[PDB]
GROMACS .gro file of C-alpha atoms in nm:
model
  373
    1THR     CA    1  -0.076   0.233   2.834
    2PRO     CA    2  -0.100   0.013   2.529
    3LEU     CA    3  -0.207   0.153   2.188
    4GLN     CA    4  -0.562   0.028   2.138
    5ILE     CA    5  -0.793   0.066   1.831
    6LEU     CA    6  -1.167   0.011   1.887
    7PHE     CA    7  -1.281  -0.193   1.584
    8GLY     CA    8  -1.612  -0.247   1.722
    9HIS     CA    9  -1.831  -0.473   1.957
   10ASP     CA   10  -1.891  -0.839   1.972
   11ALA     CA   11  -2.194  -0.937   1.809
   12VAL     CA   12  -2.362  -1.135   2.082
   13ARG     CA   13  -2.151  -1.034   2.409
   14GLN     CA   14  -2.139  -0.665   2.329
   15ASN     CA   15  -1.781  -0.641   2.474
   16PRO     CA   16  -1.555  -0.376   2.291
   17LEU     CA   17  -1.310  -0.563   2.050
   18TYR     CA   18  -0.969  -0.397   2.032
   19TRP     CA   19  -0.683  -0.400   1.778
   20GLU     CA   20  -0.328  -0.368   1.942
   21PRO     CA   21  -0.072  -0.326   1.665
   22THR     CA   22   0.223  -0.268   1.889
   23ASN     CA   23   0.143  -0.577   2.103
   24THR     CA   24   0.357  -0.859   1.936
   25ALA     CA   25   0.212  -1.132   2.159
   26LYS     CA   26  -0.136  -1.031   2.029
   27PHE     CA   27  -0.016  -0.934   1.686
   28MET     CA   28   0.307  -1.057   1.525
   29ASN     CA   29   0.253  -0.803   1.237
   30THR     CA   30   0.001  -0.517   1.147
   31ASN     CA   31  -0.071  -0.630   0.816
   32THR     CA   32  -0.453  -0.622   0.753
   33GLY     CA   33  -0.703  -0.728   0.511
   34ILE     CA   34  -1.051  -0.542   0.518
   35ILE     CA   35  -1.308  -0.690   0.273
   36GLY     CA   36  -1.645  -0.592   0.169
   37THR     CA   37  -1.884  -0.557  -0.119
   38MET     CA   38  -2.089  -0.220  -0.188
   39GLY     CA   39  -2.320  -0.116   0.085
   40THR     CA   40  -2.162  -0.302   0.388
   41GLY     CA   41  -1.997   0.017   0.522
   42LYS     CA   42  -1.641  -0.125   0.526
   43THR     CA   43  -1.511   0.207   0.423
   44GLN     CA   44  -1.682   0.357   0.715
   45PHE     CA   45  -1.494   0.094   0.948
   46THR     CA   46  -1.164   0.147   0.762
   47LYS     CA   47  -1.194   0.535   0.831
   48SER     CA   48  -1.255   0.454   1.200
   49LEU     CA   49  -0.941   0.245   1.218
   50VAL     CA   50  -0.743   0.536   1.058
   51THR     CA   51  -0.902   0.813   1.248
   52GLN     CA   52  -0.825   0.624   1.565
   53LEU     CA   53  -0.463   0.550   1.482
   54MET     CA   54  -0.419   0.922   1.399
   55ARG     CA   55  -0.576   1.021   1.733
   56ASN     CA   56  -0.410   0.739   1.947
   57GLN     CA   57  -0.049   0.741   1.811
   58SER     CA   58   0.027   0.899   2.165
   59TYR     CA   59   0.011   0.555   2.292
   60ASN     CA   60   0.281   0.425   2.039
   61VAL     CA   61   0.593   0.294   2.194
   62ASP     CA   62   0.790   0.594   2.306
   63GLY     CA   63   0.478   0.796   2.197
   64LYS     CA   64   0.633   0.817   1.835
   65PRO     CA   65   0.399   0.967   1.569
   66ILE     CA   66   0.268   0.706   1.302
   67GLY     CA   67   0.268   0.811   0.940
   68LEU     CA   68  -0.036   0.670   0.738
   69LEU     CA   69  -0.029   0.672   0.348
   70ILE     CA   70  -0.356   0.613   0.196
   71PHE     CA   71  -0.404   0.522  -0.172
   72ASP     CA   72  -0.754   0.635  -0.254
   73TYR     CA   73  -0.885   0.512  -0.576
   74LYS     CA   74  -1.239   0.626  -0.536
   75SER     CA   75  -1.228   0.962  -0.368
   76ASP     CA   76  -1.359   0.806  -0.022
   77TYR     CA   77  -1.100   0.957   0.211
   78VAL     CA   78  -1.153   1.322   0.123
   79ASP     CA   79  -1.473   1.432   0.293
   80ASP     CA   80  -1.463   1.729   0.517
   81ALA     CA   81  -1.523   1.542   0.846
   82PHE     CA   82  -1.258   1.291   0.779
   83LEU     CA   83  -0.995   1.522   0.684
   84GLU     CA   84  -1.090   1.745   0.985
   85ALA     CA   85  -1.071   1.457   1.221
   86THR     CA   86  -0.737   1.321   1.103
   87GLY     CA   87  -0.583   1.651   0.982
   88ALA     CA   88  -0.491   1.459   0.664
   89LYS     CA   89  -0.290   1.614   0.387
   90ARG     CA   90  -0.417   1.547   0.034
   91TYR     CA   91  -0.202   1.509  -0.283
   92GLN     CA   92  -0.353   1.505  -0.616
   93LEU     CA   93  -0.183   1.324  -0.919
   94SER     CA   94  -0.016   1.652  -1.048
   95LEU     CA   95   0.351   1.738  -0.983
   96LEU     CA   96   0.364   1.476  -0.695
   97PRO     CA   97   0.678   1.621  -0.509
   98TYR     CA   98   0.888   1.301  -0.515
   99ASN     CA   99   1.101   1.128  -0.774
  100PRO     CA  100   1.090   0.762  -0.838
  101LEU     CA  101   1.441   0.779  -0.985
  102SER     CA  102   1.606   0.911  -0.672
  103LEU     CA  103   1.860   0.682  -0.505
  104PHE     CA  104   1.836   0.478  -0.168
  105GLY     CA  105   2.046   0.179  -0.069
  106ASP     CA  106   2.427   0.082  -0.090
  107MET     CA  107   2.391  -0.216  -0.337
  108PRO     CA  108   2.667  -0.226  -0.597
  109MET     CA  109   2.533  -0.051  -0.916
  110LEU     CA  110   2.262   0.113  -0.718
  111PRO     CA  111   2.143   0.339  -0.993
  112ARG     CA  112   2.082   0.021  -1.203
  113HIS     CA  113   1.886  -0.148  -0.952
  114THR     CA  114   1.667   0.156  -0.929
  115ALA     CA  115   1.633   0.180  -1.293
  116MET     CA  116   1.546  -0.195  -1.328
  117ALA     CA  117   1.275  -0.185  -1.061
  118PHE     CA  118   1.128   0.127  -1.227
  119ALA     CA  119   1.134  -0.055  -1.567
  120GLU     CA  120   0.982  -0.354  -1.418
  121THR     CA  121   0.701  -0.160  -1.248
  122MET     CA  122   0.629   0.043  -1.540
  123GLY     CA  123   0.641  -0.276  -1.761
  124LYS     CA  124   0.370  -0.441  -1.539
  125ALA     CA  125   0.145  -0.128  -1.538
  126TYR     CA  126   0.150  -0.101  -1.909
  127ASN     CA  127   0.197  -0.453  -2.017
  128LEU     CA  128   0.531  -0.355  -2.196
  129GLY     CA  129   0.749  -0.615  -2.351
  130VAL     CA  130   1.085  -0.743  -2.298
  131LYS     CA  131   1.258  -0.481  -2.548
  132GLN     CA  132   1.076  -0.188  -2.432
  133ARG     CA  133   1.148  -0.252  -2.057
  134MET     CA  134   1.534  -0.290  -2.153
  135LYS     CA  135   1.505   0.030  -2.359
  136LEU     CA  136   1.363   0.203  -2.055
  137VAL     CA  137   1.648   0.086  -1.837
  138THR     CA  138   1.898   0.193  -2.106
  139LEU     CA  139   1.746   0.541  -2.149
  140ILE     CA  140   1.756   0.580  -1.765
  141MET     CA  141   2.108   0.485  -1.733
  142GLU     CA  142   2.176   0.744  -1.986
  143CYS     CA  143   1.985   1.002  -1.782
  144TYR     CA  144   2.184   0.907  -1.464
  145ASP     CA  145   2.504   0.963  -1.677
  146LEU     CA  146   2.406   1.306  -1.793
  147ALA     CA  147   2.350   1.387  -1.432
  148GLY     CA  148   2.696   1.265  -1.340
  149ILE     CA  149   2.554   0.942  -1.146
  150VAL     CA  150   2.757   0.663  -1.258
  151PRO     CA  151   2.681   0.290  -1.138
  152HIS     CA  152   3.055   0.186  -1.071
  153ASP     CA  153   3.124   0.502  -0.855
  154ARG     CA  154   2.934   0.540  -0.533
  155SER     CA  155   3.051   0.877  -0.460
  156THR     CA  156   2.826   1.011  -0.735
  157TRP     CA  157   2.520   0.845  -0.589
  158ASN     CA  158   2.419   1.152  -0.368
  159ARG     CA  159   2.381   1.389  -0.668
  160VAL     CA  160   2.033   1.512  -0.790
  161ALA     CA  161   1.861   1.227  -0.973
  162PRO     CA  162   1.711   1.300  -1.327
  163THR     CA  163   1.320   1.286  -1.341
  164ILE     CA  164   1.065   1.118  -1.546
  165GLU     CA  165   1.057   1.425  -1.770
  166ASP     CA  166   1.435   1.383  -1.845
  167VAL     CA  167   1.367   1.025  -1.937
  168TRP     CA  168   1.093   1.116  -2.183
  169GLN     CA  169   1.319   1.401  -2.332
  170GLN     CA  170   1.576   1.115  -2.371
  171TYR     CA  171   1.326   0.892  -2.546
  172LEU     CA  172   1.253   1.168  -2.793
  173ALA     CA  173   1.610   1.257  -2.863
  174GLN     CA  174   1.695   0.908  -2.985
  175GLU     CA  175   1.816   0.840  -3.353
  176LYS     CA  176   1.536   0.582  -3.386
  177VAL     CA  177   1.226   0.684  -3.194
  178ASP     CA  178   0.987   0.383  -3.207
  179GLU     CA  179   0.617   0.463  -3.198
  180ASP     CA  180   0.507   0.182  -2.979
  181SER     CA  181   0.336   0.112  -2.638
  182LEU     CA  182   0.629   0.269  -2.441
  183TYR     CA  183   0.626   0.588  -2.635
  184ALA     CA  184   0.254   0.622  -2.577
  185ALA     CA  185   0.288   0.535  -2.203
  186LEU     CA  186   0.564   0.801  -2.175
  187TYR     CA  187   0.400   1.069  -2.375
  188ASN     CA  188   0.102   1.036  -2.141
  189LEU     CA  189   0.288   0.989  -1.803
  190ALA     CA  190   0.505   1.298  -1.892
  191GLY     CA  191   0.228   1.510  -2.051
  192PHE     CA  192   0.007   1.476  -1.742
  193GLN     CA  193   0.310   1.563  -1.541
  194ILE     CA  194   0.202   1.332  -1.268
  195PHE     CA  195   0.522   1.362  -1.096
  196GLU     CA  196   0.719   1.675  -1.028
  197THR     CA  197   0.932   1.773  -1.341
  198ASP     CA  198   1.205   1.979  -1.161
  199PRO     CA  199   1.478   1.740  -1.014
  200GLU     CA  200   1.554   2.013  -0.742
  201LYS     CA  201   1.182   2.005  -0.611
  202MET     CA  202   1.178   1.640  -0.522
  203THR     CA  203   1.139   1.578  -0.149
  204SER     CA  204   1.164   1.260   0.059
  205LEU     CA  205   0.866   1.046   0.017
  206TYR     CA  206   0.928   0.856   0.334
  207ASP     CA  207   0.906   1.191   0.547
  208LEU     CA  208   0.625   1.322   0.326
  209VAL     CA  209   0.431   1.049   0.515
  210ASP     CA  210   0.397   1.229   0.834
  211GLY     CA  211   0.042   1.193   0.978
  212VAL     CA  212  -0.236   1.089   0.736
  213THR     CA  213  -0.143   1.140   0.384
  214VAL     CA  214  -0.388   1.084   0.100
  215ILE     CA  215  -0.292   1.018  -0.251
  216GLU     CA  216  -0.601   1.058  -0.456
  217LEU     CA  217  -0.622   0.852  -0.778
  218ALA     CA  218  -0.963   0.925  -0.907
  219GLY     CA  219  -1.009   1.057  -1.261
  220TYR     CA  220  -0.690   0.876  -1.414
  221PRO     CA  221  -0.676   0.557  -1.620
  222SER     CA  222  -0.600   0.230  -1.398
  223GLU     CA  223  -0.262   0.205  -1.594
  224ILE     CA  224  -0.156   0.545  -1.430
  225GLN     CA  225  -0.310   0.480  -1.099
  226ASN     CA  226  -0.125   0.143  -1.051
  227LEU     CA  227   0.182   0.288  -1.173
  228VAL     CA  228   0.160   0.572  -0.917
  229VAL     CA  229   0.089   0.336  -0.624
  230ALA     CA  230   0.348   0.085  -0.727
  231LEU     CA  231   0.625   0.355  -0.783
  232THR     CA  232   0.538   0.507  -0.472
  233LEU     CA  233   0.561   0.173  -0.287
  234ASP     CA  234   0.914   0.087  -0.474
  235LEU     CA  235   1.050   0.426  -0.362
  236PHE     CA  236   0.912   0.397  -0.003
  237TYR     CA  237   1.049   0.033   0.042
  238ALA     CA  238   1.394   0.149  -0.071
  239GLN     CA  239   1.385   0.433   0.195
  240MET     CA  240   1.239   0.212   0.466
  241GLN     CA  241   1.525  -0.020   0.444
  242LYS     CA  242   1.764   0.259   0.497
  243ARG     CA  243   1.580   0.414   0.806
  244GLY     CA  244   1.632   0.139   1.068
  245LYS     CA  245   1.439  -0.065   1.308
  246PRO     CA  246   1.185   0.049   1.565
  247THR     CA  247   1.235   0.044   1.947
  248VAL     CA  248   1.139  -0.291   2.096
  249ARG     CA  249   1.038  -0.325   2.468
  250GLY     CA  250   0.922  -0.651   2.600
  251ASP     CA  251   0.621  -0.750   2.401
  252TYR     CA  252   0.575  -0.417   2.231
  253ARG     CA  253   0.712  -0.291   1.905
  254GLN     CA  254   0.691   0.063   1.797
  255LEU     CA  255   0.494   0.146   1.470
  256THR     CA  256   0.654   0.367   1.235
  257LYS     CA  257   0.443   0.377   0.926
  258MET     CA  258   0.128   0.217   0.795
  259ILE     CA  259   0.017   0.191   0.423
  260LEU     CA  260  -0.339   0.163   0.299
  261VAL     CA  261  -0.467   0.075  -0.050
  262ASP     CA  262  -0.844   0.115  -0.087
  263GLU     CA  263  -0.981  -0.090  -0.369
  264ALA     CA  264  -0.681  -0.295  -0.390
  265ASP     CA  265  -0.816  -0.582  -0.595
  266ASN     CA  266  -0.688  -0.478  -0.935
  267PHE     CA  267  -0.347  -0.362  -0.802
  268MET     CA  268  -0.311  -0.704  -0.618
  269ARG     CA  269  -0.380  -0.886  -0.939
  270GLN     CA  270  -0.085  -0.730  -1.118
  271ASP     CA  271   0.160  -0.871  -0.876
  272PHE     CA  272   0.386  -0.575  -0.810
  273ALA     CA  273   0.701  -0.662  -0.645
  274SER     CA  274   0.711  -0.403  -0.376
  275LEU     CA  275   0.384  -0.473  -0.234
  276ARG     CA  276   0.489  -0.820  -0.155
  277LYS     CA  277   0.828  -0.700  -0.013
  278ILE     CA  278   0.651  -0.455   0.227
  279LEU     CA  279   0.398  -0.719   0.348
  280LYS     CA  280   0.680  -0.965   0.420
  281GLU     CA  281   0.951  -0.729   0.546
  282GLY     CA  282   0.766  -0.435   0.695
  283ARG     CA  283   0.747  -0.603   1.045
  284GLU     CA  284   1.125  -0.520   1.146
  285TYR     CA  285   1.099  -0.167   1.015
  286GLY     CA  286   0.773  -0.090   1.214
  287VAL     CA  287   0.594  -0.083   0.865
  288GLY     CA  288   0.256  -0.275   0.804
  289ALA     CA  289   0.007  -0.268   0.521
  290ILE     CA  290  -0.372  -0.257   0.494
  291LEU     CA  291  -0.548  -0.392   0.203
  292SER     CA  292  -0.902  -0.311   0.137
  293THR     CA  293  -1.097  -0.499  -0.130
  294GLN     CA  294  -1.438  -0.583  -0.265
  295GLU     CA  295  -1.370  -0.950  -0.313
  296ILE     CA  296  -1.149  -1.212  -0.103
  297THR     CA  297  -1.050  -1.368  -0.429
  298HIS     CA  298  -0.712  -1.205  -0.499
  299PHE     CA  299  -0.554  -1.269  -0.135
  300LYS     CA  300  -0.503  -1.653  -0.216
  301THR     CA  301  -0.361  -1.626  -0.553
  302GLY     CA  302  -0.009  -1.751  -0.619
  303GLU     CA  303   0.252  -1.910  -0.415
  304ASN     CA  304   0.343  -1.709  -0.124
  305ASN     CA  305  -0.006  -1.553  -0.139
  306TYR     CA  306  -0.097  -1.225   0.013
  307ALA     CA  307  -0.314  -1.396   0.272
  308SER     CA  308  -0.010  -1.591   0.387
  309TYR     CA  309   0.132  -1.235   0.520
  310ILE     CA  310  -0.200  -1.098   0.678
  311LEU     CA  311  -0.265  -1.169   1.040
  312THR     CA  312  -0.576  -0.929   1.104
  313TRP     CA  313  -0.879  -0.991   0.890
  314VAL     CA  314  -1.218  -0.784   0.897
  315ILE     CA  315  -1.436  -0.970   0.649
  316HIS     CA  316  -1.764  -0.803   0.552
  317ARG     CA  317  -2.024  -0.942   0.325
  318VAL     CA  318  -1.918  -1.068  -0.031
  319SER     CA  319  -2.101  -1.175  -0.323
  320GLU     CA  320  -1.860  -1.432  -0.474
  321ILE     CA  321  -1.671  -1.674  -0.238
  322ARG     CA  322  -1.483  -2.014  -0.269
  323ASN     CA  323  -1.353  -2.273  -0.063
  324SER     CA  324  -1.006  -2.184  -0.167
  325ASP     CA  325  -1.071  -1.823   0.018
  326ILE     CA  326  -1.171  -1.955   0.343
  327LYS     CA  327  -0.859  -2.188   0.349
  328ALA     CA  328  -0.654  -1.894   0.247
  329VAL     CA  329  -0.810  -1.639   0.496
  330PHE     CA  330  -0.941  -1.850   0.781
  331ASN     CA  331  -0.690  -2.134   0.740
  332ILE     CA  332  -0.933  -2.422   0.808
  333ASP     CA  333  -0.936  -2.757   0.609
  334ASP     CA  334  -1.266  -2.916   0.737
  335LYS     CA  335  -1.532  -2.861   0.468
  336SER     CA  336  -1.824  -2.816   0.710
  337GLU     CA  337  -1.707  -2.493   0.884
  338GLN     CA  338  -1.618  -2.358   0.536
  339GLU     CA  339  -1.991  -2.378   0.458
  340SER     CA  340  -2.126  -2.200   0.764
  341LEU     CA  341  -1.864  -1.938   0.722
  342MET     CA  342  -1.962  -1.881   0.349
  343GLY     CA  343  -2.326  -1.871   0.413
  344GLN     CA  344  -2.265  -1.663   0.722
  345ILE     CA  345  -2.031  -1.422   0.535
  346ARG     CA  346  -2.314  -1.401   0.256
  347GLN     CA  347  -2.578  -1.332   0.530
  348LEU     CA  348  -2.352  -1.043   0.714
  349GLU     CA  349  -2.521  -0.709   0.750
  350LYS     CA  350  -2.416  -0.355   0.687
  351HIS     CA  351  -2.143  -0.260   0.950
  352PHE     CA  352  -2.126  -0.631   1.059
  353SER     CA  353  -1.806  -0.840   0.993
  354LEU     CA  354  -1.613  -1.149   1.109
  355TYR     CA  355  -1.318  -1.027   1.279
  356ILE     CA  356  -1.012  -1.249   1.294
  357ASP     CA  357  -0.743  -1.159   1.546
  358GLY     CA  358  -0.390  -1.229   1.542
  359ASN     CA  359  -0.444  -1.547   1.756
  360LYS     CA  360  -0.672  -1.673   1.482
  361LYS     CA  361  -0.978  -1.632   1.683
  362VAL     CA  362  -1.292  -1.551   1.485
  363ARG     CA  363  -1.571  -1.321   1.631
  364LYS     CA  364  -1.874  -1.175   1.454
  365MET     CA  365  -1.851  -0.806   1.514
  366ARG     CA  366  -2.053  -0.494   1.471
  367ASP     CA  367  -1.813  -0.224   1.356
  368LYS     CA  368  -1.739   0.106   1.523
  369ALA     CA  369  -1.804   0.310   1.216
  370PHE     CA  370  -1.647   0.655   1.144
  371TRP     CA  371  -1.973   0.842   1.191
  372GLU     CA  372  -2.016   0.682   1.538
  373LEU     CA  373  -1.684   0.814   1.652
   0.00000   0.00000   0.00000
């Protein structure tokens, strides 16, 4: 009865290789790195994983459904077959029906916590300076006030949140309207009406992720794309904290939601707070993250690197690799294996990968691709 995803088959033994994300003996967390350069069919693998998860959520602990949120940078998750097999809903970057400024949590000054994280996310996305970030928090607090939401009074926290449009309107209605990078970012963010403008039409993001949900980011500058991913993740994280812990029976933990970011390299480099929070804290809420990338490079970077939270790896071929990367991903100090792994990863063929399971066992693999399903 345990949820099994067929990743592929052993390169030599030919035996089926399974992923068991509910089984905490085999996998402590569901966090997953999928790596590959162009022409290695990694996206065909990622799609199999997702299609199977959607198909086999029946086997989830208590048979509970598994929400999957996919951030699709390159329009790779919207072919007819894939949407047919998953029943995936698609959202374009127009009037997204959720509101970054809506309130979740019970911390004191809750509205200010939300404004500050929003300002920090937007500051990172557009490289805004200290003063702009502060100004943004100030304008948002004024928008919360106009809406009867006030930081010292927690009884006002269930009222309808202002939206990004109200913040832009507030920017314009100032006595001194600076014509700077924040003005430009807001003019544009609001002009494209990326998020729903009507405070009343905002729905719950967390619940919006029922089944396979695709947010397609293609055709928008990387500032807006990254902003949408990070703001969606900030909001998601806040809701997830308030929804409780999954049912645990023996070695088996129920899976509630998964998040996928495909072409994650540039987003990861920006170091958005909420991604790290989800990778670290998702486990107890039944949430995991999958990061699909071209390079391995950006998994090792910084203290508490992304690698440090990822137990499952499916490494396809990569042009550029370093020793730092093998230490990061494989976690092996001896300089000789690093080289065979490196050259071996360099030699890997289309639809072949090095699968690292949750007990750190490496196995060359031939992927079960989506078309083969």
